[PDB]
């Protein structure tokens, strides 16, 4: 239940200082195939700042992304992820896209890691992850590589405001 947030933040702050600056969130959102501007950063920060210092605290961020609960379901975030991942939007995610997404954020991953991820997310084993199966990662992926999909999903889920 809380693990989602714990990891969502853990993967966010790499310095592990106990806060997130415009720099972090900036690259985090920009690494998701988006083009965030200074306004977006300053906005979010000032939007998640209870004191007004220009920094993201521990509970602050949690509350910010927590707003997602407001939505009837997490479908929006889900589709949004698989949608932002597929640069071509062909309807499937290739090792390339996923890899770039992990590397961009700065998530050290090995050939085996990504390989297994796609191997688990792809039942047909066509080297492409579809949405239909992509959602299955949350339907009992305990034995699967749900880990990776979770981290990436959390980053792309929190990176946004919706
Ligand atoms: Ca920081
Ligand atoms: Ca603060
Ligand atoms: Ca593709
Ligand atoms: Ca497939």
mmCIF file of C-alpha atoms and ligand atoms in Angstrom:
data_model
loop_
_atom_site.group_PDB
_atom_site.id
_atom_site.type_symbol
_atom_site.label_atom_id
_atom_site.label_comp_id
_atom_site.label_asym_id
_atom_site.label_seq_id
_atom_site.Cartn_x
_atom_site.Cartn_y
_atom_site.Cartn_z
ATOM 1 C CA UNK A 1 0.000 0.000 0.000
ATOM 2 C CA UNK A 2 2.689 2.475 1.052
ATOM 3 C CA UNK A 3 5.452 0.665 -0.831
ATOM 4 C CA UNK A 4 4.280 2.432 -3.989
ATOM 5 C CA UNK A 5 5.128 5.822 -2.482
ATOM 6 C CA UNK A 6 8.301 4.596 -0.782
ATOM 7 C CA UNK A 7 9.733 3.403 -4.098
ATOM 8 C CA UNK A 8 8.147 6.252 -6.056
ATOM 9 C CA UNK A 9 10.252 8.686 -4.026
ATOM 10 C CA UNK A 10 13.300 6.460 -3.548
ATOM 11 C CA UNK A 11 13.755 6.291 -7.321
ATOM 12 C CA UNK A 12 13.105 10.034 -7.522
ATOM 13 C CA UNK A 13 15.792 11.432 -5.224
ATOM 14 C CA UNK A 14 19.151 9.887 -6.119
ATOM 15 C CA UNK A 15 21.095 12.017 -3.636
ATOM 16 C CA UNK A 16 18.998 10.635 -0.795
ATOM 17 C CA UNK A 17 19.064 13.924 1.098
ATOM 18 C CA UNK A 18 15.372 13.937 1.960
ATOM 19 C CA UNK A 19 14.066 16.368 -0.648
ATOM 20 C CA UNK A 20 13.645 17.019 -4.369
ATOM 21 C CA UNK A 21 14.635 20.153 -6.284
ATOM 22 C CA UNK A 22 13.387 21.479 -9.621
ATOM 23 C CA UNK A 23 16.432 19.796 -11.155
ATOM 24 C CA UNK A 24 15.389 16.284 -10.133
ATOM 25 C CA UNK A 25 11.705 16.540 -11.050
ATOM 26 C CA UNK A 26 12.753 18.443 -14.157
ATOM 27 C CA UNK A 27 14.915 15.658 -15.566
ATOM 28 C CA UNK A 28 12.467 13.062 -14.247
ATOM 29 C CA UNK A 29 9.627 14.525 -16.310
ATOM 30 C CA UNK A 30 11.835 15.380 -19.286
ATOM 31 C CA UNK A 31 13.173 11.818 -19.305
ATOM 32 C CA UNK A 32 9.599 10.637 -19.857
ATOM 33 C CA UNK A 33 9.579 11.926 -23.422
ATOM 34 C CA UNK A 34 8.168 15.275 -22.319
ATOM 35 C CA UNK A 35 9.426 18.842 -22.708
ATOM 36 C CA UNK A 36 9.010 20.417 -19.244
ATOM 37 C CA UNK A 37 9.865 24.102 -18.856
ATOM 38 C CA UNK A 38 11.043 26.224 -15.930
ATOM 39 C CA UNK A 39 7.411 27.225 -15.403
ATOM 40 C CA UNK A 40 6.298 23.614 -14.961
ATOM 41 C CA UNK A 41 8.990 23.006 -12.341
ATOM 42 C CA UNK A 42 8.497 26.235 -10.393
ATOM 43 C CA UNK A 43 4.744 25.645 -10.573
ATOM 44 C CA UNK A 44 4.828 22.106 -9.183
ATOM 45 C CA UNK A 45 7.246 23.055 -6.406
ATOM 46 C CA UNK A 46 5.248 26.118 -5.362
ATOM 47 C CA UNK A 47 2.177 23.896 -5.683
ATOM 48 C CA UNK A 48 3.612 21.269 -3.336
ATOM 49 C CA UNK A 49 5.217 23.735 -0.928
ATOM 50 C CA UNK A 50 3.533 24.380 2.421
ATOM 51 C CA UNK A 51 6.309 26.710 3.579
ATOM 52 C CA UNK A 52 7.425 28.301 0.323
ATOM 53 C CA UNK A 53 11.130 27.495 0.141
ATOM 54 C CA UNK A 54 11.171 26.067 -3.371
ATOM 55 C CA UNK A 55 11.847 22.443 -2.470
ATOM 56 C CA UNK A 56 9.920 19.171 -2.276
ATOM 57 C CA UNK A 57 9.710 17.505 1.137
ATOM 58 C CA UNK A 58 8.978 13.870 1.986
ATOM 59 C CA UNK A 59 5.231 14.184 2.696
ATOM 60 C CA UNK A 60 4.860 17.055 0.230
ATOM 61 C CA UNK A 61 5.480 14.965 -2.886
ATOM 62 C CA UNK A 62 3.409 12.106 -1.469
ATOM 63 C CA UNK A 63 0.447 14.456 -1.048
ATOM 64 C CA UNK A 64 0.954 15.885 -4.535
ATOM 65 C CA UNK A 65 0.793 12.520 -6.301
ATOM 66 C CA UNK A 66 -1.739 11.308 -3.733
ATOM 67 C CA UNK A 67 -4.229 13.529 -5.555
ATOM 68 C CA UNK A 68 -4.376 10.749 -8.147
ATOM 69 C CA UNK A 69 -6.657 8.868 -5.755
ATOM 70 C CA UNK A 70 -9.246 11.533 -6.570
ATOM 71 C CA UNK A 71 -9.695 9.868 -9.960
ATOM 72 C CA UNK A 72 -12.262 7.070 -10.190
ATOM 73 C CA UNK A 73 -9.410 4.732 -11.119
ATOM 74 C CA UNK A 74 -5.702 4.608 -11.956
ATOM 75 C CA UNK A 75 -6.509 3.745 -15.573
ATOM 76 C CA UNK A 76 -5.549 7.275 -16.619
ATOM 77 C CA UNK A 77 -2.038 6.945 -15.190
ATOM 78 C CA UNK A 78 -1.655 3.429 -16.588
ATOM 79 C CA UNK A 79 -2.575 4.182 -20.202
ATOM 80 C CA UNK A 80 -0.632 7.435 -19.851
ATOM 81 C CA UNK A 81 2.504 5.441 -19.042
ATOM 82 C CA UNK A 82 2.284 2.904 -21.866
ATOM 83 C CA UNK A 83 1.292 5.841 -24.071
ATOM 84 C CA UNK A 84 4.314 7.988 -23.219
ATOM 85 C CA UNK A 85 6.591 4.952 -23.468
ATOM 86 C CA UNK A 86 5.657 4.076 -27.051
ATOM 87 C CA UNK A 87 7.343 6.939 -28.904
ATOM 88 C CA UNK A 88 5.842 5.551 -32.111
ATOM 89 C CA UNK A 89 2.504 4.870 -30.447
ATOM 90 C CA UNK A 90 2.164 1.748 -32.578
ATOM 91 C CA UNK A 91 0.437 0.112 -29.625
ATOM 92 C CA UNK A 92 3.418 -1.790 -28.247
ATOM 93 C CA UNK A 93 6.566 -1.047 -26.247
ATOM 94 C CA UNK A 94 9.912 -2.314 -27.535
ATOM 95 C CA UNK A 95 13.074 -2.979 -25.529
ATOM 96 C CA UNK A 96 14.530 0.203 -27.020
ATOM 97 C CA UNK A 97 11.814 2.511 -25.692
ATOM 98 C CA UNK A 98 11.696 0.887 -22.254
ATOM 99 C CA UNK A 99 15.493 0.806 -22.048
ATOM 100 C CA UNK A 100 15.804 4.500 -22.904
ATOM 101 C CA UNK A 101 13.141 5.235 -20.288
ATOM 102 C CA UNK A 102 15.100 3.405 -17.591
ATOM 103 C CA UNK A 103 18.512 4.721 -18.638
ATOM 104 C CA UNK A 104 17.227 8.276 -19.062
ATOM 105 C CA UNK A 105 15.918 8.417 -15.494
ATOM 106 C CA UNK A 106 19.289 7.009 -14.479
ATOM 107 C CA UNK A 107 18.121 3.556 -13.420
ATOM 108 C CA UNK A 108 21.101 1.215 -13.753
ATOM 109 C CA UNK A 109 19.828 -1.825 -15.651
ATOM 110 C CA UNK A 110 21.515 -4.830 -17.261
ATOM 111 C CA UNK A 111 20.695 -6.760 -20.434
ATOM 112 C CA UNK A 112 19.145 -9.499 -18.297
ATOM 113 C CA UNK A 113 16.985 -6.999 -16.411
ATOM 114 C CA UNK A 114 15.272 -5.426 -19.421
ATOM 115 C CA UNK A 115 15.312 -8.772 -21.226
ATOM 116 C CA UNK A 116 13.350 -10.479 -18.449
ATOM 117 C CA UNK A 117 11.021 -7.486 -18.146
ATOM 118 C CA UNK A 118 9.921 -7.708 -21.779
ATOM 119 C CA UNK A 119 9.965 -11.505 -21.585
ATOM 120 C CA UNK A 120 7.427 -11.317 -18.758
ATOM 121 C CA UNK A 121 5.384 -8.402 -20.099
ATOM 122 C CA UNK A 122 5.290 -10.097 -23.503
ATOM 123 C CA UNK A 123 3.406 -13.400 -23.466
ATOM 124 C CA UNK A 124 3.705 -13.913 -27.223
ATOM 125 C CA UNK A 125 7.394 -13.085 -26.932
ATOM 126 C CA UNK A 126 7.366 -10.775 -29.943
ATOM 127 C CA UNK A 127 9.731 -8.359 -28.227
ATOM 128 C CA UNK A 128 6.869 -5.898 -27.822
ATOM 129 C CA UNK A 129 4.771 -5.086 -24.754
ATOM 130 C CA UNK A 130 1.083 -4.478 -25.452
ATOM 131 C CA UNK A 131 -1.386 -2.595 -23.255
ATOM 132 C CA UNK A 132 -3.631 -5.629 -22.782
ATOM 133 C CA UNK A 133 -0.728 -7.548 -21.247
ATOM 134 C CA UNK A 134 0.839 -4.399 -19.797
ATOM 135 C CA UNK A 135 -2.074 -4.105 -17.367
ATOM 136 C CA UNK A 136 -1.652 -7.763 -16.419
ATOM 137 C CA UNK A 137 1.498 -6.669 -14.588
ATOM 138 C CA UNK A 138 -0.863 -5.571 -11.815
ATOM 139 C CA UNK A 139 -3.010 -8.709 -11.949
ATOM 140 C CA UNK A 140 -0.557 -10.929 -10.097
ATOM 141 C CA UNK A 141 2.946 -10.184 -11.356
ATOM 142 C CA UNK A 142 4.446 -11.277 -8.035
ATOM 143 C CA UNK A 143 6.540 -13.909 -9.810
ATOM 144 C CA UNK A 144 6.933 -11.598 -12.803
ATOM 145 C CA UNK A 145 9.246 -8.604 -13.193
ATOM 146 C CA UNK A 146 6.520 -6.310 -11.896
ATOM 147 C CA UNK A 147 9.296 -4.598 -9.950
ATOM 148 C CA UNK A 148 10.726 -2.695 -12.900
ATOM 149 C CA UNK A 149 7.310 -1.907 -14.357
ATOM 150 C CA UNK A 150 6.349 -0.609 -10.914
ATOM 151 C CA UNK A 151 9.304 1.752 -10.506
ATOM 152 C CA UNK A 152 8.963 3.138 -14.030
ATOM 153 C CA UNK A 153 5.182 3.351 -13.671
ATOM 154 C CA UNK A 154 5.533 5.216 -10.373
ATOM 155 C CA UNK A 155 7.989 7.715 -11.854
ATOM 156 C CA UNK A 156 5.754 8.390 -14.857
ATOM 157 C CA UNK A 157 2.695 8.368 -12.598
ATOM 158 C CA UNK A 158 4.045 10.929 -10.151
ATOM 159 C CA UNK A 159 5.915 12.969 -12.749
ATOM 160 C CA UNK A 160 2.496 14.234 -13.834
ATOM 161 C CA UNK A 161 -0.213 16.046 -11.876
ATOM 162 C CA UNK A 162 -3.162 13.921 -12.997
HETATM 163 CA CA1 LIG B 1 17.636 16.587 -4.270
HETATM 164 CA CA1 LIG B 2 9.538 21.917 1.553
HETATM 165 CA CA1 LIG B 3 7.622 0.419 -30.298
HETATM 166 CA CA1 LIG B 4 2.512 -8.520 -27.297
#
